[PDB]
Amino acid sequence: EVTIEEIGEFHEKYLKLLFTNLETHNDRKKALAEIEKLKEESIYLGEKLRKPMYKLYLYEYPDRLEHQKKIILEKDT
């Protein structure tokens, strides 16, 4: 019942978050907000899809997002 457009859109947003610059404090504030919405969207898909594919969206991408988050928290101190 998960559509390809929901999967495509999630990954599109993820890609944009990753390609983002993070040079200024404003950018970092925005990226962090975006990370939170991506975690939520990943887990939404993961729960709806139910190595099995669903584990990537339930666990792996939220873990990678958390990683990127800590890093961005590393700069802004």
Numbering used by the authors: 178 to 227, 240 to 266
Q: What text appears in the publication on this structure?
A:
The Staphylococcus aureus pathogenicity islands (SaPIs) are the prototypical members of the phage-inducible chromosomal island (PICI) family of mobile genetic elements. Stl is a DNA-binding protein that binds to the intergenic promoter region between stl and str (the SaPI transcription rightward regulator), preventing transcription of the str and downstream genes, thus maintaining integration of the island in the host chromosome. The remarkable ability of the SaPIbov1 Stl to target unrelated but functionally similar antirepressor proteins relies on the modularity of this repressor. In this way, SaPIbov1 Stl presents three domains: one corresponds to an HTH N-terminal domain required to recognize and bind the divergent stl-str region present in the SaPI genome; a second (middle) domain responsible for interacting with the trimeric Duts, while the C-terminal part of the protein recognizes the dimeric Duts.
Therefore, we determined to solve the structure of BovI-Stl by eliminating this region and dividing the protein into two functional and complementary portions corresponding to the N-terminal (BovI-StlN-ter; residues 1–156) and to the C-terminal part of the protein (BovI-StlC-ter; residues 175–267). Likewise, we solved the structure of BovI-StlC-ter to 2.2 Å resolution. BovI-StlC-ter is also an α-helical domain forming an antiparallel three-helix bundle. We have named these helices as α11, α12 and α13 to follow the BovI-StlN-ter numbering. Nine residues (230–238) that correspond to a loop connecting α11–α12 were disordered, as well the three initial residues and the last one. The dimerization is mediated by the reciprocal interaction of the N-terminal part of helices α11 and α13, expanding the bundle from three to six helices. Around 800 Å2 of total surface area would be buried per monomer upon BovI-StlC-ter dimerization, suggesting a stable dimer that was confirmed by size exclusion chromatography (SEC) analysis. Mixed hydrophobic and hydrophilic interactions, including a double salt bridge between E189 and R253, are present in the dimer interface.
